[PDB]
Design a protein around this nucleic acid. Sequence first.
RNA 1: CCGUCGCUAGUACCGAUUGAAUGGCUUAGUGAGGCCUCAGGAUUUGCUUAGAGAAGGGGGCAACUCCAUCUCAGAGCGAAG
RNA 2: UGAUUCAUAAUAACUUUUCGAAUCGCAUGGCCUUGUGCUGGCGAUGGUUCAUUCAAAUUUCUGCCCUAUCAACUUUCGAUGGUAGGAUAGUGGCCUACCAUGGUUUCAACGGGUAACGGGGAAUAAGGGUUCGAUUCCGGAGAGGGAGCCUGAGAAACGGCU
RNA 3: UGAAACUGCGAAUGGCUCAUUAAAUCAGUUAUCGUUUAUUUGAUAGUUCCUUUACUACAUGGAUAUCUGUGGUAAUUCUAG
Lengths: 188, 260, 57
Amino acid sequence: GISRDSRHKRAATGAKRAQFRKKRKFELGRQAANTKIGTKRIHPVRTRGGNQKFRALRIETGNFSWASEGVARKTRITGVVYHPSNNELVRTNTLTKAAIVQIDATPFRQWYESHYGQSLGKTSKNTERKWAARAAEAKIEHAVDSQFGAGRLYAAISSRPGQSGRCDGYILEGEELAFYLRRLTAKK
Amino acid sequence: ARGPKKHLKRLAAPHHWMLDKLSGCYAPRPSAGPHKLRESLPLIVFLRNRLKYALNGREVKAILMQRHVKVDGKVRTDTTFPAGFMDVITLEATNENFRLVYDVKGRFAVHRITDEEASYKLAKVKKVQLGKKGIPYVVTHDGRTIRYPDPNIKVNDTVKVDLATGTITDFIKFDTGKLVYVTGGRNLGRVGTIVHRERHEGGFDLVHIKDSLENTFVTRLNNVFVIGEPGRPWISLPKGKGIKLTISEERDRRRAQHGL
Amino acid sequence: MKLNISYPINGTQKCIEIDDEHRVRVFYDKRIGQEVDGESVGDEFKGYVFKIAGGND
RNA sequence: CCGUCGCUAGUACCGAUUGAAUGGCUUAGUGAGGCCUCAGGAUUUGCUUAGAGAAGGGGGCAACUCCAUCUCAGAGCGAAG
RNA sequence: UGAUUCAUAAUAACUUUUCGAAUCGCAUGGCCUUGUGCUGGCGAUGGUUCAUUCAAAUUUCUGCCCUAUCAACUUUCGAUGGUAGGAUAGUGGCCUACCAUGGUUUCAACGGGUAACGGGGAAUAAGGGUUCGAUUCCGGAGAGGGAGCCUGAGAAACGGCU
RNA sequence: UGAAACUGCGAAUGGCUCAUUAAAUCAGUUAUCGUUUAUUUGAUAGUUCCUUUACUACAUGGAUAUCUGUGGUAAUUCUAG
Ligand SMILES: [Mg+2]
Ligand SMILES: [Mg+2]
Ligand SMILES: [Mg+2]
Ligand SMILES: [Mg+2]
Ligand SMILES: [Mg+2]
Ligand SMILES: [Mg+2]
Ligand SMILES: [Mg+2]
Ligand SMILES: [Mg+2]
Ligand SMILES: [Mg+2]
Ligand SMILES: [Mg+2]
Ligand SMILES: [Mg+2]
Ligand SMILES: [Mg+2]
Ligand SMILES: [Mg+2]
Ligand SMILES: [Mg+2]
């Protein structure tokens, strides 16, 4: 029904291409998922070659990742903070790929407390040595720290949840992060 | 149309079957196997039109069921199993061991091979990749995939496969001046040495190849198969031995050799 | 009209044709998946308990 | 031999009828039916030790020398629907 | 490899944790720690991504019959391109958002007609040609029309459904 | 031995027809480093465990059809208990 035909689309010039054949299944495109954040729901869809393809619906949670540390966690999402394609996805609050979001962050904090164990926002004798050996490696780019303190880390989700089902993304760092922040500021 | 096509019409059937234009509507569609439809040979065509050990399709089927046929070690029961180039068909009653090898004209010649040679299969190299768990594996243009090949077995080389075990006896490196057998188009079935290799970035690597008669010809790399070193081929080739004579010459041969 | 009565454990069941309308009138405006008594349905059935499930227009 | 005006046939041309018909596009309004979707929950059951009558309801009066025990009021927790 | 963010292998997590043989026919072997113990043959089917084969969608280049009594068309309702998303098995204005104003055209765009399915080929036959090709082969469409979808590896199937 | 039925697979091939369709289809030619691919033959998974002093294995569960029975209908390759 909803097709991906280049049969329709007039032409490069403009001539109205007549309806050559009734559109096929292999040309199809399904209805959009546009996953929100409100109770965990998934529906698969039997695609071409069989092959299930999990559609995220109202997806809560997902493993958002650090770059500097090289880690990710069983972490909740809060809200759709800024989506750069369309702002209608921020009113309705529809999570998607490369939409900027705020991350529960508690899990991250916990992990840090194991990893380095110096705390963000503001025992045992040989493990002390280990701790000493670690830490003072990554100083973190201020904004991130603030987010951590808040309980709301700025990420960009990069799993396509309408295709994958999972809602796994990326803690924002550096220049891109800054840009995103700026955009957010402009919006608000 | 609407999915995979299941028939093969007798005119649309590939010519190197050498089928009758007449005598039924269809030809046997060679099923999914280790060889490409048109570059294959089904077990009906072999046991009916070539050998004539079966007078008809039913007979062939019966023979298959009896399980004296073995294409490459394993048994086979499918009428239309595509036995292709280099495949060794052994009929255990008769002991008529065959290797499917091309004639100079192009069609598959019935090569009545000995029992000791009909044992291995020479086969080309289509790919060299690594699979899961970091294991390097070679692929053959003649069907098989063999795990763990001698690191210096690269693409378009040839490989003597033990066949019974399905391993690697030996290999020939593709290079200048190494006996080669042809499997494509106008030069299909000839045999030669290899002179050049026109490299060409993307668009088909050519190969200038001379035969025993010093007659040059060119083919694409995919249409060439390395059969040995000049003088010593690794397989017994049929009468003619990939020479391919001129028409006039052929005629002369025909009308000189009148031995009643 | 007709009735379609079946016992589970014994595995024995029967036709009960009912031309008398009063008897029929017990089941009106019930729904598939409910319980019924024996005595109101007829004089032959007394003490029994039907379970209304299934039927046909 | 050329025109006008006559008679007899036929071809097309224009042409009021607010003509008629078929199809192709098409405004506005409606909008069947499925697909996803928000819910919705007929029914089907598992696991909970949840008290039985049970006549060795685990190898001889007894929390059976208590057995996937006799089995429904449980109710909780699901899964499918 | 002509060429990669390739093959592929590690570190990190998530996962409404896929898969990981409570499977059917013959045959009934080998060690005694003499239990019926531990053991082992010929096969069937399934099941993972990688091959292959059968294929599959697209896709590059070049090539169509008549018409100016069709010279502008496309672009409100995607036209051309971008960026991002969405979707798709995947590429892609395929769809959405935001922006730019492109894109095609007398080397006939666009429109109209075809008593046009395309090609292999057919008839004619000095050479060049001209006409025909519904029709045994290859492709493509369609199953009264138009729409929509289930199942399925593969259908927008019509000897399936709505 | 085997009716019936559930599971499997097949029914998307083939056959027909030429209505549309004029850079569309189609012809040769490339490409998928741009993808799916039952079937095919080749391949192949000690890590399911989650603190490690008493725990599901020489075989786990309840269904549903054939049937047999209780039927409706004016009827339909109709199917309710
Ligand atoms: Mg698959
Ligand atoms: Mg290439
Ligand atoms: Mg990679
Ligand atoms: Mg894109
Ligand atoms: Mg024509
Ligand atoms: Mg037509
Ligand atoms: Mg034609
Ligand atoms: Mg016609
Ligand atoms: Mg045809
Ligand atoms: Mg008709
Ligand atoms: Mg249809
Ligand atoms: Mg019919
Ligand atoms: Mg059909
Ligand atoms: Mg067909």
